[PDB]
Amino acid sequence: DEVVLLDFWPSPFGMRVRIALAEKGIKYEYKEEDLQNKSPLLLKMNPVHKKIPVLIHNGKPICESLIAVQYIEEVWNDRNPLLPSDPYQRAQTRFWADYVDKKIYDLGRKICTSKGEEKEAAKKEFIEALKLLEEQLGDKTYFGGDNLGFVDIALVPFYTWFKAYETFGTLNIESECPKFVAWAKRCLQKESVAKSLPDQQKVYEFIMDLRKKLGIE
């Protein structure tokens, strides 16, 4: 049984798959991709999108981070269930992971790259989204309840981008959304998460360089 993950270290999408694999206790080979110089392997495995992450299981690719996490859930179904068994609860978990997928990366990218009114609107919507997510969390330890679940996996990687969001967006997420930050730190107490996520400083530095190389600031 071979498991390989094509990834790029600061990608929140790849981090999702890293976490799912670690949480299931699945040993795998991580392969770092240069997105400026995509490998023949990456191009062969994801011809449609040419993006990471790509999960390769016994030579067969699974593209799209959340689809890969669901695949992991369905194949390694012995322990640590990432989705609820009840259909309605499963639909809700999918709904919120979908919400994260649609909002967070894009709003964050606009925070880090856009300017003026687009930037302002992105900041506002970003905080609104975090607050909606806080509301959904309620007084649960994780979105998954007492254990990490699909939504936690979908969402917590974006925490690694928080210094970038706060610095370039002039936000103080800590004071606006303390429930959210406390939740993220709880996730970071889990080995599966800790070992999958780079530090906020490394990501901040990477994004700073990215901006400087895009002629932003």
Three-point CA angle 58, 60, 64, nearest 5°: 125
The option from its own copies, ligand 4NM, ligand GTB, none interacting with 51 (CB < 5 to 8 A, set by class) reads ligand GTB
Binding-site residue positions for glutathione = 38, 51-52, 65
Closer to its own copies at the Cβ: 14 or 164? 14
Q: Determine if 48 is a binding residue for its own copies (CB under 8 A).
A: yes
Name which of its own copies, ligand 4NM, ligand GTB, none residue 60 binds, using a CB cut-off of 5 to 8 Å depending on partner kind: its own copies
Q: Taking CB under 6 A as the rule, does residue 196 contact ligand 4NM?
A: yes
98 interacts with its own copies by CB under 8 A: yes
User: In 120-149, which positions are buried (b, 16+ CB within 10 angstroms) versus exposed (e)?
Assistant: eebbeebbebbeebbeebeeeebbbeeebb
Binding of ligand GTB by 180 (CB under 6 A):
no
Q: Between 66 and 171, whose beta carbon lies closer to ligand GTB?
A: 66
Q: Check residue 185 and report its DSSP letter.
A: H
Q: Residue 2: how many CB atoms within 10 A of its CB?
A: 10
Residues 136, 103, 117, 177, Cα dihedral to 10°: 30
Distances (CA, A) of 198 to 9, 40, 51, 111, 188: 7, 26, 20, 20, 11
d(CA 197, CA 53): 14
204, two tokens: 């901040």
Sign (positive/negative) of CA torsion 110, 113, 117, 120? positive
Here's the x/- map for ligand 4NM, 141-180, by CB under 6 A: it reads as ----------------------------------------
Cα-based angle 194, 92, 80 (whole degrees, multiple of 5): 40
**Options 34, 40, 60, 213; binder of its own copies; rule CB under 8 A:** 60
What track of x and - describes contact with ligand GTB for positions 45 through 84 (by CB under 6 A)? Answer: -----xxxx----------xxx------------------
**Shortest distance (Å) from residue 156 CB to ligand 4NM:** 13
- Is 88 a binder of its own copies (CB under 8 A)? yes
Binding site for ligand 4NM (CB under 6 A): 9, 18, 30, 109, 112-113, 196-198, 207, 210
